[PDB]
Structure 1
Amino acid sequence: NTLSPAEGSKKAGKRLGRGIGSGLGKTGGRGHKGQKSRSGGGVRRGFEGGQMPLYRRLPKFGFTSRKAAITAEIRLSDLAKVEGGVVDLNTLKAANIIGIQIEFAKVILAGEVTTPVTVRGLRVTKGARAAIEAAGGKIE
């Protein structure tokens, strides 16, 4: 009724998870305590991302290679068999999650189930010759 509701206001929803006693970021509360790294710990942090360097000086160094065509697009047997049907050449790949704004791919026989659908691709490996030959179709 017109009485101070036993409780019906705002402190309700849900504690993120476990009893959040106070806001995060708390470690060594106000005042003095540890929470740090004794010794030369102060004016500046320790690491930097390099070294003296004894290791970074001149190990078995390499270099910055030139940009590649950016092939390597997983096109596995199955997931292309137990799905859709025939006609799976360059035009119907967007349907599947096989569509890089770049080019090329490869077939990786994750499964063996017969299909026997055909697939162009523009690439090929062992197993790409196997199958789609014993099943039918033509690779390019």
Structure 2
Amino acid sequence: FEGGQLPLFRRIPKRGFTNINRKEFAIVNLDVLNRFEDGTEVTPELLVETGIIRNEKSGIKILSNGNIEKKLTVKANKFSAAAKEAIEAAGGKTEVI
């Protein structure tokens, strides 16, 4: 309240809409994936069992924030281009679930 002066929110406009089929994905980085011995297989179930993840919100997504040092096969719902590149460059491989 501002004394009958028009409030800030009433002097500016509404914006947008909430989508109903919105998909938000659990965000995994590369730094975590150094925890595993090379040549093994990473999965959603494994990442939950290890407590890295609790909520598979609408899926998993692996982002290239950081670095890996280790060869790995990874499988998830969506990857970023850069993280795919880094995984391959370490000799890893990628599957899309």
Query: TM-score, normalising length from structure 2?
Result: 0.68
Bigger helix fraction: 2
Bigger strand fraction: 2
Question: Partner residue of 1:105?
Answer: 60
Shift of 1:115: 1.0
Indicate yes or no: 2:33 matched with 1:77: no
| Larger relative contact order, structure 1 or 2 (CA cutoff 8 Å, min sep 6) | 2
Which has more radius of gyration? 1
Percent identity over the alignment is 20
Unaligned runs of 5+ in 1: 1-46
Question: Partner residue of 1:137?
Answer: 93
Shift of 1:108: 2.6
For the Cα contact (< 8 Å) 1:105–1:121, is it kept in 2?
A: yes
Residues 56-114 of structure 1 show CA distances to partners (whole Å, capped at 9, x for unaligned) of 2241322451342331x221112212x13321113201113223152223223333242
Question: Partner residue of 1:31?
Answer: none
Q: Which runs of 4+ in 1 moved over 6 A?
A: none
Query: TM-score, normalising length from structure 1?
Result: 0.51
Q: How many residues align?
A: 90
Shift of 1:122: 0.5
